[PDB]
Amino acid sequence: ATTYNAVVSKSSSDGKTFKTIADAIASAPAGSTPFVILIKNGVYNERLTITRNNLHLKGESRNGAVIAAATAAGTLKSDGSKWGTAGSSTITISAKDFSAQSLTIRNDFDFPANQAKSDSDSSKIKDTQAVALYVTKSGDRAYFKDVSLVGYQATLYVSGGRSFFSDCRISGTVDFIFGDGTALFNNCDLVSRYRADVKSGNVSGYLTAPSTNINQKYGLVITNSRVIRESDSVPAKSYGLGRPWHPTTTFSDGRYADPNAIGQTVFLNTSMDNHIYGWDKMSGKDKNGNTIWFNPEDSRFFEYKSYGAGATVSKDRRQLTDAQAAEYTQSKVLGDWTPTLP
Template sequence: MRYLIFSTLALFFHSVSAAPDFQAVVDSSGGEASYRTIGAALAAAPAASEKPYVIYIRNGHYREKLTVNRSNIALIGESQKSTLITYGAFAGQKMPGSDETWGTFHSATLTVLAPDFSAGNLTIENSFDFLANDALDRDHPRKIGGTQAVALALDGGSDRVAFRNVRISGFQDTLYANTGRSYFVDSIIEGNVDFIFDAGTALFENSDIVNRRRAGGRMPSGYITAPSTNIDSPYGFVFLRCQLRREDGVPAQSVPLGRPWHPTTDFDDGRYADPDAIGASVFIDTYMDDHISREGWTSMRGTARDGTKSMVFTPESARFFEYLSRGPGAAVNAARRQLSTEEAMHYARDKVLRGWIPPFADP
């Protein structure tokens, strides 16, 4: 049954321009659409559905902050470049009508909390102007803190979520993948500081991972991944046949592939860096432009038991590996650990996703 559902969604995705079968239409300009906002269409979706509830979104700029808390929702846009979902919340910003701030994990433009979600042919963007703030001196009166601004958050009951031909855009903390399994194919994920992060299992296939510039030529100019994968999970972030690219203005040798994040966590004996967050990031058969640092990876500080940021977690303490990297940013040295051919075979799609077959995944 699940295979038939996936096949139906795959057929829908590839034939979307030819009067696709959908359950709701969103059109910001009105017309004959059922809904003028995506939020209204989501609110009208069934609480539970045995097959994908497809919401077709016509081209437009949808300034909405959305949460998906119902299973089997599919958001399919008319085109990736012209179907734009955007919001500008950031961690240090006060929530409307409150003295409390969003915080990193609630700043997302789109938050998925339910299983079997899928999306295609659209852009999800956090529009917070990170660069304008980044350009200000540290003591400037308009300088703000808490610049983490998530575009897409996968949390709560999120699992078996799939994206094809999507653009996920932000700067710091663009993609928060905390729980479950997620799959990204033929897509673009762009940001600068730790822009793919947290504890979930995410597979990226044939996608562009784009580093965006910092203001003032800061070094390092960013970090691609900051995984906090639990030690009991064999897979964190896996990149298969991807392309690591950069915007103009991102210097050569300025971006590590990742750093190990040990989130500050409450335990019975105190609050400190989670020792079981043994981050995992693996790049296989991936093109790397010259912005990737020769060392490949870097360290990250964590909270000690005394509350200071005095703990240092090195790349060697994490599960950071490569196999068949190529391009001007590729290198083989003692700092960039390589998988053997036999080890790389354990990172095939079916193994990483533990048997889940994503909708619209190629054979």
């Protein structure tokens, strides 16, 4: 028995429906009773911020129900200020017990077109992060099933509590799954995209950039998934599995890269094509303003039973034991939360 509180559609011949997703979400009564919105096929050019608990979106199909907007971190607002990375997100989840099912969420910032612009072009953006989906510090228990997330740099920003991604597609280039959240991915395709602007022999991107606090048990956990190249033009050994993001953070003694953001990315039973070379380092600014490098060997970067041509076992790619792997079950990673759909 499944019923919808609101329906969104492009058609006026459809009937008693909302024309925008934002209107349907806003129509929800104040409170925390479940509110479920059906979104009929179409491309909805909208930016959304979810602040109501227990809100659920269901698209007609992943292929055909699309929420999309184009915003880069370096895109300017009316007051002349930049949106910033967090501010660039197409969808922002700042509530508990959110779910989205059978829909695509895109940031349509045309990264390749931007990079192709002449260096003297004033419209060429340097701050090229363009987030599709952002789960904030206020988000916990966010569930995404049969969802496609589209972007280049910084596609998925997972902060705050626990999120679960199931039967998913996520595409991107540089740090396309990043943040300090507990984010579990099961049976998703992680799609590394072609970079026309990267020279032969240089790195095209990094799947993950975790900023997991050292005291937090789980960061980014990827299980039973596929790490795939977008095309045969994506070179061998062009993508890192992860690099350690130590976010610029305001402390009592200044603003600098967080020393305690010692990120975790763990891959279990995941296929990898040969575009994967292994893990990588990442730079930030220290308390004195100097460049500081954070190394993968000092980070919580692990694999368990990877397979496919990108799945090499060396001293630079630490492996879990069977006993250690058992600590990364859904039950342990998500704790007392069982992700459920309405």
